[PDB]
């Protein structure tokens, strides 16, 4: 009850800002997520016991892939963390409880798959899910680990708050189907600038956290260039993997995954930050004002891979 988390005084302080990076000790990523919880939240937010118990039954179901794992699920929380801090008054204290919790558990039991290759290689899970294969697989683990005994970290919510809190990860964890995105980021766009957005309407605010959703999945854009250069290589590992996979299946595979095409790597960084990203963040800043300095950073790490293509570096 009276047992604060502490954190030595540069990660207190970078912790806050967005572009802060939870570092190589996998050990404390625990520790920085409960900490986040307590002042994003509260400390009566979550009994202490279960908390942890349900971070660890989290952390064991993710798996040793190169980018979507337990530190991915870290950083995009950390993301939301400062979002939800920088917008303190604008979200209910069932959305501050959920929205951490979905971005915890948003790529839980990833294979390091794109939807695409399930669908080809014909795998269980396709048939279960027509589409958003993954990111129903992931809420549906999310809901196999809230109901492990001694894991129910909502225990104290009422009948019907427990199922608003459930309803908030479910939409949250789909939204991360980034083919979702595109359409999402439109209305909003639309929305915004013909002054009809409404944040009393609840499928607004549902469409603001889908980009919310996004923008913390995306944020190994808006790191410090050395971050965001080394986590593309993450992401270039599985993608090339998957690359190998579709040759496999006698599939040219598209041209992002394919490892003969590792030159075209910055050149494809620009399409994805002018297609993806800087839209993204645009979009958030215009809804969000205080999210501009993902925007800022994202712009910063567009131009540093201008720099790569003029062999500037
Ligand atoms: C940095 C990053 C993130 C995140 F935000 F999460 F960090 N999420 C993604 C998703 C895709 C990609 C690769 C972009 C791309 N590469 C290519 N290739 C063609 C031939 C060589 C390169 N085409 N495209 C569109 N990066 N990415
Ligand atoms: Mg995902
Ligand atoms: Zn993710």
Same mark, same amino acid.
């Given at each position: 009850?009276?047992?604060?988390?502490?954190?030595?005084?540069?990660?207190?302080?970078?912790?806050?800002?967005?572009? @802060?990076?939870?570092?190589?000790?996998?050990?404390?990523?625990?520790?920085?997520?409960?900490?986040?919880?307590?002042?994003?939240?509260?400390?009566?937010?979550?009994?202490?016991?279960?908390?942890?118990?349900?971070? #660890?039954?989290?952390?064991?179901?993710?798996?040793?892939?190169?980018?979507?794992?337990?530190?991915?699920?870290?950083?995009?929380?950390?993301? #939301?963390?400062?979002?939800?801090?920088?917008?303190?008054?604008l979200?209910?204290? +069932?959305?501050?409880?959920?929205?951490?919790?979905?971005?915890?558990?948003?790529?839980?039991?990833?294979?390091?798959?794109?939807?695409?290759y399930?669908?080809? @290689?014909?795998?269980?899970?396709?048939?279960?899910?027509?589409?958003?294969?993954?990111?129903?697989?992931?809420?549906?683990?999310?809901?196999? =680990?809230?109901?492990?005994?001694?894991?129910?970290? @909502?225990?104290?919510?009422?009948?019907?708050?427990?199922?608003?809190?459930?309803?908030?990860?479910?939409?949250?964890? =789909?939204?991360?189907?980034?083919? +979702?995105? @595109?359409?999402?980021?439109?209305?909003?766009?639309?929305?915004?600038?013909?002054?009809?957005?409404?944040?009393?309407?609840?499928?607004?605010?549902?469409?603001?956290?889908?980009?919310?959703?996004?923008?913390?999945?995306?944020?190994?854009?808006?790191?410090?260039?050395?971050?965001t250069?080394?986590?593309?290589?993450? =992401?270039?590992?599985?993608?090339?993997?998957?690359?190998?996979?579709?040759?496999?299946?006698?599939?040219?595979?598209?041209?992002?995954?394919?490892?003969?095409?590792?030159?075209?790597?910055?050149?494809?960084?620009?399409?994805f930050?002018?297609?993806v990203?800087? *839209?993204?963040?645009?979009?958030?800043?215009?809804?969000?004002? *205080?999210?501009?300095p993902?925007?800022?950073?994202?712009?910063?790490?567009?131009?540093?891979?201008?720099?790569?293509?003029?062999?500037?570096?």
């Amino acid at each position: 009850g009276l047992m604060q988390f502490t954190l030595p005084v540069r990660l207190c302080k970078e912790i806050e800002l967005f572009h @802060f990076d939870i570092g190589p000790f996998e050990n404390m990523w625990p520790g920085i997520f409960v900490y986040m919880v307590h002042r994003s939240c509260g400390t009566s937010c979550f009994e202490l016991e279960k908390l942890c118990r349900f971070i #660890m039954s989290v952390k064991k179901n993710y798996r040793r892939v190169p980018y979507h794992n337990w530190k991915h699920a870290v950083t995009v929380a950390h993301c #939301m963390y400062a979002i939800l801090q920088n917008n303190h008054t604008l979200f209910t204290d +069932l959305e501050r409880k959920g929205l951490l919790i979905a971005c915890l558990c948003h790529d839980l039991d990833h294979r390091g798959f794109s939807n695409s290759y399930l669908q080809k @290689f014909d795998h269980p899970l396709a048939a279960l899910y027509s589409t958003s294969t993954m990111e129903q697989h992931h809420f549906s683990q999310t809901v196999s =680990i809230l109901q492990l005994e001694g894991h129910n970290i @909502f225990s104290t919510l009422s009948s019907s708050e427990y199922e608003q809190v459930l309803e908030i990860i479910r939409k949250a964890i =789909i939204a991360t189907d980034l083919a +979702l995105y @595109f359409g999402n980021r439109k209305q909003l766009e639309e929305m915004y600038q013909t002054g009809s957005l409404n944040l009393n309407n609840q499928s607004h605010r549902d469409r603001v956290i889908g980009l919310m959703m996004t923008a913390c999945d995306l944020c190994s854009v808006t790191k410090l260039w050395p971050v965001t250069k080394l986590t593309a290589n993450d =992401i270039y590992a599985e993608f090339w993997a998957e690359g190998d996979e579709m040759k496999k299946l006698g599939i040219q595979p598209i041209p992002m995954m394919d490892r003969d095409k590792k030159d075209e790597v910055p050149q494809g960084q620009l399409g994805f930050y002018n297609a993806v990203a800087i *839209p993204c963040y645009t979009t958030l800043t215009q809804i969000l004002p *205080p999210t501009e300095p993902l925007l800022k950073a994202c712009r910063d790490n567009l131009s540093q891979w201008e720099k790569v293509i003029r062999g500037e570096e």
